[PDB]
């Protein structure tokens, strides 16, 4: 049903690479610009790679990168929507990050929250929500990507700095652990791509977080945005906001919450 013959696409330009496989910009049927996720034949089991596609089959939303097709035979390809701007993390860290201010950044957060609100409604967990897994298109369109770890609320190792402590400690992955991650994502947005918990390693992060440590308000970030971050980081997962709440709070932000916002040098 999602199967297409491989001769239907042509891999044009290389975009990303690793021990994982490759990522290619290409054309499908000689008309549609696509993105093509290749696997290096022998780095992970055939369907552990392909599970990403199988979750992407179940989930369609305008703020989630959308699965186009799959070639099941080897070499195996996952075909998806092409995002012209690449990674949110890279975008934020690069020459385009200089000129982004709170209004653009809050709008990007609100789009990501919209995508996550859908994931919430569908009884899924993403498990890997972070700026490196948000993709940017034209006109500052942000979409959540990389559903490899996503499963239904009926892995092996997880980035302590973005993972809710109950999920890192005891494997308690809920939509509320994804809310925790979204709060971390909000610091990526307001520090322009900086790694969370500067100068702290993983082991330091865990016990700090367990003892009640939370990141401070980033410079030029309104306290009301930091307050929202800290709600996302409540110790009790059920004390954390819904994505429905986050989406609406972020959409309405400059009327309801900061009607007096004045642009600074960075935010």
Ligand X SMILES: Nc1ncnc2c1ncn2[C@@H]1O[C@H](COP(=O)(O)O)[C@@H](O)[C@H]1O
Breaks (C-N over 2.5 A) in the chain follow: 154
Number of alpha carbons in the 13 Å side-chain half-sphere of residue 141 = 14
For ligand X (CB under 6 A), the number of binding residues is: 14
Question: Is 146 assigned a catalytic role?
Answer: no
Interaction mask 165-194, ligand X, x per CB under 6 A: ------------------------------
Query: Which candidate in 90, 128, 236, 252 is catalytic?
Result: 128
| Residue from the set 39, 78, 83, 221 that interacts with ligand X by CB under 6 A | 83
Out of 146, 176, 184, 233, which residue is the one contacting ligand X (CB under 6 A)? 146
195 in Cβ contact with 161 (< 8 Å): yes
Binding mask 205-244 for ligand X (x = CB under 6 A): ----------------------------------------
Q: Could you tell me if residue 11 is left (phi over 0), alpha (psi between -120 and 50 degrees) or otherwise beta?
A: beta
Which window, 15-23, 201-209, 213-221, 236-244, contacts ligand X (CB under 6 A)? Answer: 15-23
Strands 67-71 and 134-136: unpaired
CB 129 within 8 A of CB 191: no
Candidate segments 77-85, 93-101, 185-193, 215-223, binder of ligand X by CB under 6 A:
77-85
Which residue, 201, 185, 172, is CA-closest to 233? 185
Distance CA 194, CA 156 (A): 25
Per CB under 6 A, which region of 78-86, 95-103, 118-126, 183-191 contacts ligand X? Answer: 78-86
Which ranges of the chain does DSSP label H, i.e. alpha helix? Answer: 46-56, 88-93, 102-121, 165-170, 175-190, 202-210, 223-232, 243-251, 253-256
Q: Nearer Cβ to ligand X, position 82 or 233?
A: 82
**Considering the complex, what minimum distance in angstroms separates the CB of residue 85 from ligand X?**
8
- Work out whether 35 is an interface residue with ligand X (CB under 6 A): yes
Length of the chain: 267
Residues labelled catalytic? 128
- Judged by the rule CB under 6 A, the positions of this chain that interact with ligand X are 15-16, 23, 35, 37, 65, 80, 82-83, 86-87, 135, 145-146
């Amino acid at each position: 049903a999602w199967e297409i013959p491989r001769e239907s696409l042509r891999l044009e330009v290389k975009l990303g690479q690793g021990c994982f496989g490759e990522v290619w910009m290409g054309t499908w049927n000689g008309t549609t610009r696509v993105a093509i996720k290749t696997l290096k034949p022998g780095t992970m089991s055939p369907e552990a790679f392909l599970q990403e596609a199988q979750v992407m089959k179940k989930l369609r939303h305008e703020k989630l990168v959308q699965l186009y097709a799959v070639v099941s035979e080897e070499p195996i390809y996952i075909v998806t929507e092409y995002m012209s701007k690449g990674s949110l993390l890279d975008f934020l860290k690069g020459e385009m990050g200089k000129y982004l201010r709170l209004p653009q950044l809050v709008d990007m957060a609100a789009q990501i929250a919209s995508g996550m609100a859908y994931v919430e409604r569908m009884n899924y967990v993403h498990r890997d929500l972070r700026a490196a897994n948000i993709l940017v298109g034209e006109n500052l369109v942000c979409k959540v990507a990389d559903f490899g770890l996503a499963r239904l609320i009926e892995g092996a190792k997880f980035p302590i700095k973005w993972t809710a402590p109950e999920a890192a400690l005891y494997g308690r992955f809920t939509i509320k652990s994804d809310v925790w991650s979204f709060g971390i994502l909000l610091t990526e947005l307001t520090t322009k791509g900086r790694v969370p918990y500067p100068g702290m390693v993983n082991r330091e992060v865990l016990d700090q977080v367990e003892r009640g440590y939370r990141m401070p308000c980033p410079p030029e970030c309104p306290e009301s945005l930091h307050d929202l971050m800290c709600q996302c980081w409540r110790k009790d997962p059920e004390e954390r906001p819904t994505f429905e709440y986050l989406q609406a709070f972020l959409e309405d932000y400059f009327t309801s919450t900061e009607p007096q916002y004045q642009p600074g040098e960075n935010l």
